[model samples]
Target chain A: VYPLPENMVYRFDKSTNILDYLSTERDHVMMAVRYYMSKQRLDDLYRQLPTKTRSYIDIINIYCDKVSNDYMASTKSFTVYDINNEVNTIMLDNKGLGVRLATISFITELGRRCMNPVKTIKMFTLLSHTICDDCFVDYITDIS
Target chain B: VYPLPENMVYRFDKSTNILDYLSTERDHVMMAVRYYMSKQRLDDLYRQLPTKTRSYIDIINIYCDKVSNDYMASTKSFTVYDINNEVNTIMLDNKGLGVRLATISFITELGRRCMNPVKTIKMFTLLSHTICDDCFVDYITDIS
Candidate 1:
């Protein structure tokens, strides 16, 4: 099981679960999903490169599929379009926190839509760490 | 000529005019439109009186038609639906200034779509005052 960091742990307990986190951390989750979409777009670009030049992360969306699917099932709070709409509103207003949270949420949602089952285990492993460690992509490259 | 308040005077000069006011004071104008719509809703409710009672203001949407029409023609910034969307986003975010300006814009737009002319004159007259007085509806009921 992917272990959550101490901060994320507060989003869950005996009485709470992922669904609660989905609601409370809605903006962060959506932001993560957006980051994931960018990564996916990057994946598309990498696809056109020579086979030998492609990296493992470039070939797969990793564990995003299961993460997104699972999260999508838990909450009908917002769709991708809805997330984009909120993002536009938040950014237009120059709300600093709103922008950051939305970004995190976007990347998380993208990770859920990932396509590679084999790579997903490790991908999710890193993602969990990423989420816990304030969701940095710095560790992304370090993971196998 | 309409005597604009001191605050509004800052929005224009000889080289700049009412058209410039339309651009800079757009949010204030829209909010006035919303306030007008609320007034319109109240008017509709009053229409069902047993004695068929009607005030002069009841029959006319006056200056709103001109104000709304003129401003609407000047800028294609947003549709009524778009206006509502921004209003919701602003209000939900608890943005005090955005909410006030959007309200003015809403009322200004509503004034433009007014069906009657006679009463709208007073309506627009009051609305002009409303825009100048920081978009407050305090003067709405005070007009003839």
Candidate 2:
């Protein structure tokens, strides 16, 4: 299991057991699943990598500043081409495949959750941490 | 099930029913799901809200400026408290109820899609539309 964050451990340190810790923090624990997809976390990973490997993160969109730029336009409508092109970009390389797909799934879920931004945001941050934690890889070095 | 977006309508001005219009834009139709959650669309919604009601949108996090800020932090390790706080804020409610819940769900999805900022950004726009299209209630006059 992934070790808890400093803040998480600090807050729940007194619990003395897994269930107690998570139960007291059930809401956060449930939401923690989505934190697996946090861009801050991704950016940290990108920075920590060797420069040679850093590019791989960018290539696979370790973070996407522009992924939802459409959300920026004054009047916007997404085209099928735009979405497909995005999917093609992230999946170009096969490694980190799980994380890559995780990102894509968010977009699809966003669409599914469309007609509601709050739900979409919630969907983004809430899920099974099991899927995203292990999805990170360094292309050639990390095995899928 | 929903009618096609303007672009999804292509050039066709007239069609007998849903099936007739859909076939012409099959390409876009295939990837239309993600288009539902657009932050741009969400912004449009906030802009349309009367000032009195506008506050409700912010209170509900009709959009999450800081939802995934953790994604912006250092360390792949992220805190769950942040997300819990965010969700609690959305549900805090002037109680738009379903519409309010829609916004919360949007943020959750955005969190789930946190692996990349692009996913987060898109979810806002994508779901921004989803919530409103279905929740088109002017709280001023909207019943429940």
Candidate 3:
């Protein structure tokens, strides 16, 4: 069974709104998100969670943090390979944890090359369930 | 005459290394950087800087700061349109000051959305001449 946090379904849906306005060029990213979520049975996992124990965003934040931390601890650096591996690993079994980690990983890969930082930050903020809100705001503040 | 910063040529080359390792999916972003630099006659301008004044990184930091502040003050938020407009304005006759501003603006846009925050920060650190070193480092620490 997938090790899922409570309210994952609600949170994933809420977080996905960030992509609602994006273009087709981002289709792959969205597809990745969907494939992972569906393969892992995220919705089913959410229903089994102990009620009122945690919010969806909180769960997403926890998973995302763990994934980021795990990568830093293991890789000590970011590379094109690491990003590719992260997504490829997830696609293998559709592991819930792996999917969550890969989502952020892919986004990070795309953002660095994006033509606009503000939009990138906004997208991450919404997709990661506001986990990147402070980072986004601070970046804008520092650069300005 | 274009307002060229000291060591601009050197710093830009260093900062660009971040993209050297990236894939072609990021061509537009790189093109923007190259197009602006060439059009502004950055090479010719750099040669004319007062022999012992500020470094290009220092000048970049200054213009980057100004552009960010001006955007924040006037727009109160970052948007794709705003970024495009800012760059287009600078492209006119390769205004040195405007070109400098556009550089950071474009980097920030790309970095914020990049798939790897670490790399993004690293690129910005080198490009902004370390003006954003502490900020980028702190951000990674805070998030991870």
Consecutive 10-residue window with the lowest summed lDDT within model 2 chain B? B66-75
- lDDT, candidates in the order shown: 0.42, 0.43, 0.37
* Candidate 3 to native Cα RMSD, angstroms: 22.6
TM-score, first chain, each model: 0.25, 0.26, 0.27
Q: Can you give the DockQ of every candidate in the order shown?
A: 0.01, 0.02, 0.01
**Model 2 stretches astray by more than 4 angstroms:** A1-43, A62-144, B1-55, B59-96, B99-144
Per-residue alpha-carbon lDDT of model 2 for A1-144, expressed as tens digits? 011133422222222222222333454455466456656777787678886666654554533444544231111343434444555555555445555645655565445424333544443444322223333444323531
Q: What ordering of candidates by DockQ runs from best to worst?
A: 2, 3, 1
lDDT of 3 by residue, B1-144 (tens): 148775887655544443443333223222222222221222222232232212322433455556667882112242434544554454443534344445555655454334343343334434443222233323222332
- Write down the worst ten-residue block by lDDT for model 3 chain B: B32-41
- lDDT by residue (B91-129, candidate 2, tens digit) is 343233333443444456445535434545554554444
Per-residue alpha-carbon lDDT of candidate 1 for residues A16-131, written as tens digits (9 for 90 to 100)? 22223333356547757966986898788877887443443442344433343455423444244444455445555553433333455564545444433334345445434434
Residue B82 in candidate 1, Cα distance off native in Å? 24
What ordering of candidates by lDDT runs from best to worst? 2, 1, 3
lDDT per residue as tens, model 1, B20-80: 4455577558757976997898788887764323432341233223223323323334233
TM-score of each model, in listed order: 0.18, 0.23, 0.21
State the displacement of the C-alpha of residue B140, model 1, in Å, after optimal TM-score superposition: 21
